């Protein structure tokens, strides 16, 4: 599913991601924009053989099981395919663990390089939230 911007903002807010670990909703929408272009089915292979999955490009190196990242962890205790669903619940629940691991949203390179320090509120501007 390719979310609309305000649609994703509303879904993230409903799932408790707005202001989670101090990160406003615009930060999460911006992260999803540049990680996945709002596409829940996004996947990208990393140089180490791991794969990033879903709207927040969560890495099988640590967070989910895809059966093809030998030696990796599954800290969210989910199959990586669950991060590709049209329902964002699994991605949100796992993102909450990631952003709590000590590095905040720096866990998302695209957030650090394209959202951090910018006017992230623009990503929720105009939405009925």
> 106: phi > 0 → left, psi -120 to 50 → alpha, else beta; which?
alpha
User: Cβ–Cβ contacts within 10 Å for residue 123, how many?
Assistant: 24
For Na ion, the binding residues in 23-62 under the rule CB under 5 A are 60
| DSSP symbol at 39 | B
Burial group, residue 88, by CB count within 10 angstroms (0-12, 13-18, 19+): buried
Of residues 40, 72, 90, 94, which one binds Na ion by CB under 5 A? 72
From 20-28, 36-44, 71-79, 82-90, span contacting Na ion (CB under 5 A): 71-79
Q: Which of 7, 18, 48, 52 is catalytic?
A: 52
Residues that bind Na ion (CB under 5 A): 60, 65, 69, 72, 74
Which residue positions form the known binding site for substrate?
A: 101
Catalytically active residues, by annotation: 35, 52
Which residue positions form the known binding site?
A: 101
């Amino acid at each position: 599913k390719v979310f609309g911007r305000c649609e994703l903002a509303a879904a993230m807010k409903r799932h408790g991601l707005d202001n989670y670990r101090g990160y406003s909703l615009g930060n999460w929408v911006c992260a999803a924009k540049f990680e996945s272009n709002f596409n829940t089915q996004a996947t990208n292979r990393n140089t180490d053989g791991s794969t990033d999955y879903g709207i927040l490009q969560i890495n099988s190196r640590w967070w989910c099981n895809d059966g093809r990242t030998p030696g990796s962890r599954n800290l969210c205790n989910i199959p990586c395919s669950a991060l590709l669903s049209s329902d964002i619940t699994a991605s949100v629940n796992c993102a909450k663990k990631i952003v709590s691991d000590g590095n905040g949203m720096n866990a998302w390179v695209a957030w650090r390089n394209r959202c951090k320090g910018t006017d992230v509120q623009a990503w929720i501007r105009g939405c009925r939230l």
